[PDB]
Design a protein around this ligand. Structure first.
Ligand code: HEM
Ligand SMILES: Nc1cccc(-c2cccc(-c3cn[nH]c3N)c2)c1
Ligand SMILES: Nc1cccc(-c2cccc(-c3cn[nH]c3N)c2)c1
Length: 393
């Protein structure tokens, strides 16, 4: 037989029985990635947290020439370290402020947008596609608003993303075409005097502030492209697969409809059980480091399997069960942990809470319109998502 291959399954509606057997028997194990490289797959909560909290397991070094790769880069190497470059440029606080859901009018914009999407679907009549015609448009709208760019520009930026977030053994020609086009767009946004709000409005002013005169124009455009893309794919994909989890649980659907104040606790459990990340998070060892029974050598690739941690019964008892009263509810790794913890975590939570709240109010009888096994799971992609999510109500 051959070395165990990753990823195990592109299905995002159920975790393979194999994850638990692996966590029990070999919570750090050698695997082969789609490039042919070997890697260490880490699947216990204890060992996942160890790796993510040890900066000697480096994110930015995964982009080094000649390194073992999970998949091919779809961006310039520089972009892997985007957050680090943001911090170095003195821009961290400004970016963080721009992407909080606490911005005035933001939460109202999201409710209005979700309700308008849902009303259109209702007028159209069942079946409706909750990914393409609800979750992703809601994510796209949200990020145009957060960035301060026109809503009409959202769809064009969105269309890059089915290629941008591919998980490919080889470089993708279309990825560079789309990247360069999107950078040109964001550079234009920075020169556009009408753009005065949101992240791009603030970046446009900092660009002309003397305290930032030696920060490159390319970094400013890059922040816009990177935050739009990673945000839209992460929120759209999470909400989509969370809606599947909810639809599959009519009693939970009914409980949250009846007591919407439990929706935050519900979204937090839906984050914990979410299978939207298709691959472990990659890190490259910059030293020889003991992880469980394995001495990981300098230059080796480590993959942090988020559902490994998040379904670990030693940390989350009855891990497949959605429990709204856990003692450790936010201690999951859905947003990562440590140096690279997600800066959009609050925005992601609110996108999902508001989307779910609006759906349950508009479509209290929502159900799948096809048998679950008929969902088509996107392959060789950095997220697990159904190509369409047909529902009736
Ligand atoms: C439900 C929504 C989201 C989920 C599940 C999610 C998940 C994650 C995870 C797991 C990481 C850690 C990656 C690693 O350590 O290798 C991360 C980092 C990051 N996220 Fe998110 N994310 C979400 C929303 C967002 C949003 C809305 C934005 C921006 C608008 C965003 C921007 C980023 C960035 C820039 C990083 C890299 C941070 C760094 O390198 O220090 N994410 N996210
Ligand atoms: N929301 C999210 C989740 C996981 C990773 C990122 C993120 C943010 C910035 C850059 C990169 C990136 C681009 N190429 N390779 C990597 N790791 C990835 C964002
Ligand atoms: N080629 C392309 C075009 C537009 C956006 C992006 C993009 C933007 C942000 C993150 C990533 C990415 C690629 N691999 N992993 C991550 N997070 C990719 C790439």
């Amino acid at each position: 037989t051959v070395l165990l291959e990753v990823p195990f399954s592109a299905r995002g509606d159920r975790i393979p029985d194999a994850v638990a057997e692996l966590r029990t028997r070999e919570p750090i194990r050698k695997v082969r990635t789609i490039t042919g490289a070997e890697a260490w797959l880490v699947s216990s909560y204890a060992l996942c947290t160890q790796v993510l909290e040890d900066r000697r397991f480096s994110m930015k070094e995964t982009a080094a020439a000649g390194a073992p790769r999970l998949n091919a880069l779809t961006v310039p190497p520089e972009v892997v370290n985007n957050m680090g470059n943001i911090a170095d440029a003195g821009l961290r606080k400004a970016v963080m402020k721009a992407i909080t859901p606490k911005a005035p009018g933001l939460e109202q914009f999201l409710r209005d947008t979700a309700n308008s999407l849902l009303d259109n679907l209702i007028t159209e009549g069942a079946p409706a596609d909750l990914r393409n015609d609800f979750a992703d448009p809601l994510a796209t709208a949200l990020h145009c608003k957060v960035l301060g760019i026109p809503q009409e520009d959202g769809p064009k930026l969105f269309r890059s993303l089915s290629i941008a977030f591919m998980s490919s053994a080889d470089p993708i020609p279309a990825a560079k075409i789309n990247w360069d086009r999107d950078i040109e767009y964001m550079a234009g946004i920075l020169e556009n005097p009408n753009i005065t709000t949101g992240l791009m409005g603030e970046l446009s002013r900092l660009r002309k502030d003397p305290a930032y005169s030696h920060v490159s124009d390319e970094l400013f455009a890059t922040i816009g492209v990177t935050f739009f893309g990673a945000g839209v794919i992460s929120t759209g994909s999470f909400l989509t697969t969370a809606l599947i989890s909810l639809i599959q649980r009519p009693q939970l659907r009914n409980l949250l409809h009846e007591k919407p104040e439990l929706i935050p606790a519900g979204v937090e459990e839906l984050l914990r059980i979410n299978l939207s990340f298709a691959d472990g998070l990659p890190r490259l060892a910059t030293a020889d480091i003991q992880v469980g029974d394995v001495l990981v050598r300098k230059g080796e690739l480590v993959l942090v399997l988020l559902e490994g941690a998040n379904f670990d019964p030693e940390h989350f008892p009855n891990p497949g069960s959605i429990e709204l009263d856990r003692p450790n509810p936010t201690s999951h790794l859905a947003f990562g942990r440590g140096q690279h913890f997600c800066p959009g975590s609050a925005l992601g939570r609110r996108h999902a809470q508001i989307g779910i709240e609006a759906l349950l109010k508009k479509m209290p009888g929502v159900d799948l319109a096809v048998p679950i096994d008929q969902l088509v799971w996107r392959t060789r992609f950095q997220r697990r998502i159904p190509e369409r999510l047909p529902v009736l109500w």
